[PDB]
Design a protein around this ligand. Structure first.
Ligand SMILES: *[C@H](CC(=O)Nc1ccc(C#C)cc1)C(=O)OC
Length: 325
């Protein structure tokens, strides 16, 4: 599968690291009008949290070069100008977060790509979360969104819990890290991040309603942003339809993690802390020891996620899936 990446922020760079390692995915091109090839190579080589790339990185006037593989580079403000038809780009991965609707992501189709994968939530493109609703994709949909990293953490765990015990209602808190610098629409967010706990909204709990229609209207929540490494944790307080015990929840989650959700949902019982998940490619790692059940239908469930790395692995997953179709 021949892919091109638009945008070389955190996500585009990690999607590229992962796609270089996928045997059936070939990275053909990169586009980003705001950086030069030498900065792109620097940014790709170094990462404060996910380590130096274990391989050789350089560049020339027309490529970024990774372990010898030359990857053509472009600087187009308008993706309609990119040579995707000429380059034979099967799937364009858009990680700019600005061409994230059906009419704007269309530009990659116009430029010659067969399909587009938006690495950001979308109001108009269909949204897919691996292990939740990817079986619902059909090969006539040409533009799709991988939702958000918090949605990717919550939705697999919510699906498992709802399938086994039913969710009547749930309230979610995410203790959310500073990913990168991501302030006149959000006053709390313009305060110094570095020493503060900063409450914030989130649409993650409601976007689960898109990929799990049966949970529509049954979840909401909020976030506390903290100044830690790029690993966050979801704190899900659910009212259940059916009585259960915490050991039963553990077995159900563990079975899904070892079975149908292998590689997407993880499971631990160790005395973990957030930095133990830097680089973890799961969407959601259930922390069995951190959760707590009060009564047979009322439980707090806890799940970790590297908010860049698991998401970016799911992106390349969705790319292969959309291609396998
Ligand atoms: C996952 C990474 C991420 O969570 N970025 C993020 C989201 C919300 C806020 C706020 C307020 C800050 C940073 C991702 O990129 O999904 C879109």
């Amino acid at each position: 599968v021949r892919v091109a990446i638009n945008g070389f922020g955190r996500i585009g760079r990690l999607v590229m690291r992962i796609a270089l390692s996928r045997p059936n995915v070939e990275v053909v091109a990169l586009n980003d009008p705001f950086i030069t090839n030498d900065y792109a190579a620097y940014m790709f080589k170094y990462d404060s949290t996910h380590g130096r790339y274990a391989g050789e990185v350089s560049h020339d006037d027309k490529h970024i070069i990774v372990d010898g593989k030359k990857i053509a580079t472009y600087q187009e403000r308008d993706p309609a100008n990119l040579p995707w038809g000429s380059s034979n780009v099967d799937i364009a991965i858009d990680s700019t977060g600005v061409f994230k609707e059906l009419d704007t992501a269309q530009k990659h189709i116009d430029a010659g790509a067969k399909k587009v994968v938006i690495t950001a939530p979308s109001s108009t493109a269909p949204m897919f979360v691996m292990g939740v609703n990817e079986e619902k994709y059909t090969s006539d949909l040409k533009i799709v969104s991988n939702a958000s990293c918090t949605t990717n953490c919550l939705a697999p765990l919510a699906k498992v819990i709802n399938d086994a015990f039913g969710i009547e209602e749930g309230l979610m808190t995410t203790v959310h890290s500073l990913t990168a610098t991501q302030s006149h629409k959000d006053w709390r967010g313009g305060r110094t991040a570095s020493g503060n706990i900063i409450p914030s909204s989130t649409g993650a709990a409601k976007a689960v309603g898109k990929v799990l229609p049966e949970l529509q209207g049954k979840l909401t929540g909020m976030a506390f942003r903290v100044p830690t490494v790029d690993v966050s944790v979801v704190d899900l307080t659910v009212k259940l339809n059916k009585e259960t015990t915490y050991d039963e929840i553990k077995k159900v989650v563990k079975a899904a993690a070892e079975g149908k959700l292998k590689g997407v949902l993880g499971y631990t019982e160790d005395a973990v802390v957030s930095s133990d998940f830097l680089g973890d490619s799961h969407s959601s790692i259930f922390d069995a020891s951190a959760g707590i059940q009060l009564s047979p239908k009322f439980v707090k469930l806890v799940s970790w996620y590297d908010n860049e790395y698991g998401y970016s692995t799911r992106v390349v997953d969705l790319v292969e899936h959309v291609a396998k179709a």
